[PDB]
């Protein structure tokens, strides 16, 4: 019954573990040398460029594991899509009220001799264009800081990876390759870590995207299940049991 929502919850909490830990810890970012590249790979698996690859594969794969009760599965991926739309809607809509530095911006204004008092005594958009110019004077990492922003926004990356992971844990505990759960969990954590290491986000931001991710996934499961039909074990109790007893077979 409510079991999904239990697991989902637990999942959130689990994924809340690392960032709250970090958040409490007083850690700060600064230069290093090879980690940046791996973290950049991990974030690039969510960036779109590519993709859109991870996303589709996870989509279809989920649909396989989501068989039987697949009637709601599509509904589910529609709801998620809907909020996704809603998402890009709000994102693009307000870039006004942010006014917050990204971990690297602080180190920058410092390193570049920019009185913080004066730094915020200046405008709003001019600040951003100045961060752009200060960035202009590794390379790909610069490309990423430019492409992203001066101001820190919510974490899309976190939200996406975390929503996937949450979906994974929550709506399947009854096994289709539990490797999928463990992998989405570790991967999600890896994206969040990727954001931290790259001077992209403050730990609180990660915590919050994980929460948003939680609420989104929750509302989506409850609503998709409302109309019509849940998963729940599908007949697939017998089929999953049939795959379970195949584990001890050989003889």
Least CB distance from residue 233 to ligand LDA, whole Å? 22
Residue 84 in the binding site for ligand LDA (CB under 6 A) = yes
Q: Is 113 a catalytic residue?
A: no
Token pair for residue 67? Answer: 């068989």
130-136 long-range Cβ contacts below 8 angstroms, 24+ apart = 131/105, 134/108, 134/109, 135/108
Among 35, 74, 88, 110, binds ligand LDA (CB under 6 A): 88
Return d(Cα 221, Cα 86) in angstroms, integer.
Answer: 17
Among 4, 15, 80, 169, binds ligand LDA (CB under 6 A): 80
CA nearest to 130, candidates 152, 153, 146, 148: 146
Among 156, 174, 229, 234, binds ligand LDA (CB under 6 A): 156
Q: Before 232, cis peptide (omega within 30)? A: yes
Q: Among 112, 113, 144, 201, which one carries the catalytic annotation?
A: 201
Among 165, 167, 207, 231, binds ligand LDA (CB under 6 A): 167
Question: Are residues 198 and 141 in contact, defined by beta-carbon separation less than 8 angstroms?
Answer: yes
Q: Which is nearer to ligand LDA, 145 or 164 (CB)?
A: 164
Least CB distance from residue 153 to ligand LDA, whole Å? 7
- How many chain residues are in contact with ligand LDA, going by CB under 6 A? 13
Question: Are residues 230 and 69 in contact, defined by beta-carbon separation less than 8 angstroms?
Answer: yes
Residue 45 in the binding site for ligand LDA (CB under 6 A) = no
Q: Which residue is nearest to ligand LDA (CB)?
A: 87
Question: Are residues 196 and 203 in contact, defined by beta-carbon separation less than 8 angstroms?
Answer: yes
Q: Is the dihedral of CA 245, 2, 73, 172 positive or negative?
A: negative
Q: Using only the alpha carbons of the chain, give its radius of gyration.
A: 21
Q: Is 55 a catalytic residue?
A: no
Residue 87 in the binding site for ligand LDA (CB under 6 A) = yes
Residue 95 in the binding site for ligand LDA (CB under 6 A) = no
Residues classed as catalytic: 157, 201
Question: Which residues contact ligand LDA (rule: CB under 6 A)?
Answer: 80, 83-84, 87-88, 91, 156, 159-160, 163-164, 167, 216
């Amino acid at each position: 019954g409510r079991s999904i929502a239990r697991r989902t919850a637990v999942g959130a909490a689990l994924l809340l573990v690392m960032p709250v830990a970090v958040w409490i810890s007083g850690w700060r970012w600064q230069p290093g040398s090879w980690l940046l590249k791996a973290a950049f790979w991990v974030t690039e698996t969510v960036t779109q460029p590519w993709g859109v690859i991870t996303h589709l594969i996870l989509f279809g794969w989920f649909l396989w594991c989501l068989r039987f009760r697949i009637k709601a599965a599509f509904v589910l991926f529609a709801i998620l899509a809907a909020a996704i739309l809603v998402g890009q809607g709000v994102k693009s809509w307000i870039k006004d009220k942010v006014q917050e530095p990204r971990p690297f911006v602080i180190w920058l204004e410092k390193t570049h001799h920019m009185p913080v008092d004066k730094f915020y005594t200046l405008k709003r958009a001019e600040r951003g264009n100045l961060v752009k110019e200060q960035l202009a004077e590794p390379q790909y990492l610069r490309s990423h800081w430019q492409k992203e922003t001066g101001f820190a926004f919510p974490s899309g990356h976190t939200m996406f990876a975390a929503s996937w992971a949450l979906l994974a844990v929550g709506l399947l505990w009854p096994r289709r390759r539990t490797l999928t759960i463990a992998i989405l969990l570790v991967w999600a954590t890896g994206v969040m870590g990727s954001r931290l290491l790259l001077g992209m986000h403050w730990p609180r931001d990660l915590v919050v995207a994980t929460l948003i991710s939680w609420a989104l996934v929750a509302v989506a499961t409850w609503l998709a299940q409302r109309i019509c039909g849940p998963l729940t074990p599908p007949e697939e109790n017998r089929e999953i049991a049939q795959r379970e007893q195949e584990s001890l077979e050989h003889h």
